[PDB]
Amino acid sequence: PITGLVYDQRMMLHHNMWDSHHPELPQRISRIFSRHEELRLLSRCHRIPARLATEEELALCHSSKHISIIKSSEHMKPRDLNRLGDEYNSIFISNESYTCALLAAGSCFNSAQAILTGQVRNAVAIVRPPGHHAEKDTACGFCFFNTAALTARYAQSITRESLRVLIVDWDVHHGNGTQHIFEEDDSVLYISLHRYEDGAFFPNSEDANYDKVGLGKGRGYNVNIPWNGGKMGDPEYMAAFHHLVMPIAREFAPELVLVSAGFDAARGDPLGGFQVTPEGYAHLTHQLMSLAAGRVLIILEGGYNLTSISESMSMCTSMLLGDSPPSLTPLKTSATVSINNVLRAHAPFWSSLR
Ligand SMILES: NC(=O)c1ccc2c(c1)CCCN2Cc1ccc(C(=O)NO)cc1
Ligand SMILES: [K+]
Ligand SMILES: [K+]
Ligand SMILES: [Zn+2]
């Protein structure tokens, strides 16, 4: 009946040497860590050490070439770092980026191991750079390796291939990498909520639409909940969890839950433009804790308002520790439309939606 926490100051070393104000800042993780101390959560948790992912672990999800290319950046001069980052959509690289990405993934492997070996019930990973946009063969959107996807495969590698893992991605962006990595898998249920705007919102692909339900034996195991029409908040997210995320997750019956927990849908985020409150994130966390005998690992993805992410992730940890949920309106029309589109898309696969 213990909550694990992983954080390591070394993940701050990845930085943007050309634009020190780029929103994916080092102090995202230190601010969140500090807020956990201030709220007296850190002393309630079991500290899990960070470690480097190995290259063989990276190969659970990534090509040898991709791994090789990111590793080669450790030794590059500034202009070669610039050139290499520019071969991707929305990436900056410093000499420390590869190590930090390794630490983010390995931290999460150690957390999943702690859960699956019974050392802890649940856990939180305060890590950067983020992961969910990283593809098999490429970096994207501040992400080098797909930490959550790798964690699902690492879990399978210490249990069985068919271990049922649910990944709930509540970052405001679509986890294109995660979707693609698991598109043909029925062992990993990917559920993403994300701002879409008919492709106007990053990463700007119709892959994120509600009709992408999975492929082959993975058909039904990819659930996209795309928002259109501007700001969404607690009412919409609670409704999506009520009608879609929780009924599907219960029917799937996961043995492990990973949260791609970006906090860029939060009130105050300059990129997300949404209004999810710390109390809202606490309720989402508490609902997920009813799955998988409580085996939930919360992995930081995006989120760029330092105060908002610190308060929101801390509230999630409070819920993992067993604190009672804090106290928390009709949905915007477009949100009803989105939810109904996903329900229609997934009723063929999930009896609970019928
Ligand atoms: N303010 C900025 O420097 C900045 C950087 C990147 C960016 C924007 C602003 C707004 C348009 C889209 N992008 C790319 C981007 C933005 C967010 C993320 C992210 O949070 N993914 O989960 C990944 C990539
Ligand atoms: K998402
Ligand atoms: K899948
Ligand atoms: Zn994001």
TrEMBL record:
Binding site for Zn(2+) 3: 169, 178, 260
Lineage, opening ranks: Eukaryota, Metazoa, Chordata, Craniata, Vertebrata
Positions that bind Zn(2+) 4: 171, 173, 264
Binding-site list for Zn(2+) 6: 212, 346
Sites where the protein binds Zn(2+) 5: 182, 188
Residues noted as binding Zn(2+) 2 in the record, renumbered to the chain: 169, 171, 173, 193
Gene this chain is encoded by: hdac6
Coverage span on the entire protein: 442 to 798 of 1081
Entry's family note: Belongs to the histone deacetylase family. HD type 2 subfamily.
UniProt name for this protein: Protein deacetylase HDAC6
Cellular location(s): Cell projection, Axon; Cell projection, Dendrite; Cytoplasm, Cytoskeleton, Cilium basal body; Cytoplasm, Cytoskeleton, Microtubule organizing center, Centrosome
